[PDB]
Amino acid sequence: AVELEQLAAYGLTGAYPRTNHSVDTIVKTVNNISATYSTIAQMLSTIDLD
């Protein structure tokens, strides 16, 4: 959700997203998320699943 004036200002100035981080950091973060999901899944399957 955005309001009209903010979107209009963004469009008029022709702004674009910009970043200086590298690719590997983001994929490392995604891998970390997947790892923390898989750890919980393994714990549940080895302890609670019944």
């Binding site: 590997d24 891998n31 970390n32 997947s34 790892a35 898989s38």
Partner: protein, 51 residues
Amino acid sequence: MASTTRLVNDRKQLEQQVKDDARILADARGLNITTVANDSATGGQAIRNVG
């Protein structure tokens, strides 16, 4: 067009001949091979399997 127009080629042939006979007679003294070691490692980032 006379014998004076054959001086540059004469110098070329003389230079080649001198270079050859300066090496036919030069002594053959072999050196001793040294500085041989395993120093060609390769770096890079690991894989680091997630799970």
